[PDB]
């Protein structure tokens, strides 16, 4: 929502309130998504300034406030900055920005990230190139220098983030993505490799001096249909946890498959079906083990551009004897969303 | 303050800066409110969208930022989401919303919550139905389906919130409230019962498989007078602490009494007097013990709809030999408030 | 950016997104500023309401969100309230405000706080009077009661803030500052003394029942030139740390010198040079030791009032055998800033 537009600078304030509850069998400790209150809220701004006829500068900030916490010590659990960056965009040259932003491999994994609540399981945060990561300098080019419409690409430099935990750390890396869009279809591929930190190497699970993440994707977004498919492969990058021996690390190799189909009815109801399967391989002590494996059946009711209800059902196919202890129960999310 | 109003969605941004200092005898450790800097700030939004002529959707978010902290490790102490919810309101049918919101029993305890700084002692947060609680689905009906003016009611389902601490947890519950308003008067009553969590049961103080909170109230809000009275009773719900044996839990039974009288002078000065007395009973090892017992004398000076000063004096009647260790000293709050 | 202006209340929303990276030799553990991602974002409001023709009320809130954190446990590290206060301003009488605000001695140290990223090293936060401190009641008078133009002064009462750590605590204090501005020049002096807390006294480093901070300054801000110089002296106030014996406390005495020179080119480039030297004396076990000692060479490119790039180089003169373990390596900051 544009709240300022004077003297060649415009600022949009964005926010949503999401009333959200998850339902699962017991405590939800052996379920896909958990059990209980998951209400959150989001606030941010997006400003673009016209420096000259060809040059424009921008900045985005986006923050998540959890409303499912109390007023005691747990008051901040889940609060985080999603995105926070600035950059410059010139004519038909491209754009450059640095900050906390989407990894370039999310240019591909975003195709199947359309479920009312869930989906996009492989797009972990603070995981190199698949999700929101800190310290990324990203060059992007749309319409290939204004010569070929629909043909976009991007190159990204990931800065080293040596943090307290191996889960949220990374070393230097490079990545890129190419995409084409024609008459309703979009195809995309993205790749990224980076150095691992010593602390990551020192974990039980995962072994290798380099992490690697790539993925392809196809989508059809027209005539009220949304159909998409993603395939991705990772090396030493997907974060895993053994809930039995209570160790953590990274999967030496994962094969990721995400499918999704939605139809948008005129009167606002948007049903969806989806498949998601992530298989880890060469896991220390375990061997092969599935991380994610479900079918999804859901629907969102759009009242208008500002209000929506949704239900999302996960038919979890993960077996009860999963070697890594991955939860095997189903989970249902029921949501009510005000956004501007 | 309305900052957006285009295409049937309006958004209000709200905020206040509250310069605030408390004065007490020693460290304030044996006082009502404490001693030192209590400056805070608040920010939120409130959006309502017109879906059709009869249906409207809304969302509220409200956040508290403490300014009395430092820039070190204590930087977030007191920061919290007060409210965060969305819902739908239809014609003369009623409204429904889910999220972190006021407990339905606060429909009654809000009558005496009008002191410049203090008062409303029984409306604890994260305490079932008396204050701000997370995961509440609330149906509300004003003017009894548009048939009887002044006659409002509400029913509320409290979701289970199993947290790390027994103080901030709760199980499933139901509650409701009815109110009538006529020629300046308002009468109200509210009730709520809920299951306790196992962790709550396992505490030294309090015993029972169910928590219970109810209260009645009368107010007179006209001719520049504000007069209100509240009476409430709780079972296994009021959080208590024994500062001697350093244990905590819940009071098996409390009797709550809150009175308040204010007059609003034309030139902005609004003096107030108030009484508050909360007596816990059947406390393990202690027996009977008062939790709150004071007289209040204060005044607010309203410069206008955006600026105010206030002083609030608590004449604390709690005895120095209180069995639970409740603080017995007086406390004075001096405040300066900018709000929009 | 003014987002509301109805009925004699105006509200400005402010924010910036700062993409920022520091470069240093190894881990940055022996460097001036460190090494890695330093992206942050800021949001706040500033409201002023016209109560009558002579009286106006105001309020400021300003918050810092770190974007260089992850989404795990370190998600809030660095998040803080910078400022949060309200007050009243009357005609030619002056202004009064209370809250978390700038110490009065910053009226002087702000002269040399103009580097693209660094500088202003002596203006520590939560350090009595030199930086952002909590619980300050400040009277300010501009143009000496409207009689002498350019002649401003301020008196400040610092409230006691007894916190968990000795670094961020303080006792009661008073301070003041006087400044004159004439044909492009500004001269200033400020003084402040305060009681130390018992916890501060109990530290290894620093000894004395009272803290003391004063400083003078000259600036020339015209004809596209910025030239400034600061000299300050502290007693028992400057926070120090011995990274060898891993102790902390306060310096019994510091001599502070800050110089800065900048030129603003028409086409947006603003190069800068600066010197900064802070010498601690009478340090327990150490004797004399330098805390800060560098030359700075940097430049900011201003695209316009909303967008800028900058590079800041610190030529660190601190010797590798510094007795307190102060880092001796150079550091380079590269920044891109969107602000409104
Ligand atoms: Zn965003
Ligand atoms: Zn995103
Ligand atoms: Zn509110
Ligand atoms: Zn409230
Ligand atoms: Zn500010
Ligand atoms: Zn400041």
Coordinates of N, CA and C and ligand atoms in Angstrom, one line a residue, chain B residues 45-46 60-62 82-83 85 102 132, ligand 3:
Chain B
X45 N -1.0 -1.7 13.4 CA -2.0 -1.3 12.4 C -3.3 -1.9 12.6
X46 N -4.3 -1.3 12.0 CA -5.7 -1.8 12.0 C -6.3 -1.5 10.7
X60 N -5.8 -6.8 13.1 CA -5.2 -5.9 14.1 C -3.8 -6.5 14.4
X61 N -2.8 -5.6 14.5 CA -1.5 -6.0 15.0 C -1.0 -4.9 16.0
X62 N -0.5 -5.2 17.1 CA -0.1 -4.2 18.1 C 1.1 -4.7 18.9
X82 N 1.3 -7.6 21.7 CA 0.1 -7.5 22.5 C -1.1 -8.2 21.9
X83 N -1.4 -7.9 20.6 CA -2.5 -8.4 19.9 C -2.0 -8.7 18.4
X85 N -4.4 -10.5 15.2 CA -5.5 -11.4 14.8 C -6.2 -10.8 13.5
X102 N -7.9 -10.3 23.4 CA -8.3 -10.2 24.8 C -9.2 -11.4 25.1
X132 N -4.7 -10.4 27.7 CA -4.2 -10.8 26.4 C -3.7 -12.3 26.4
Ligands
LIG3 ZN1 -4.5 -2.6 20.0

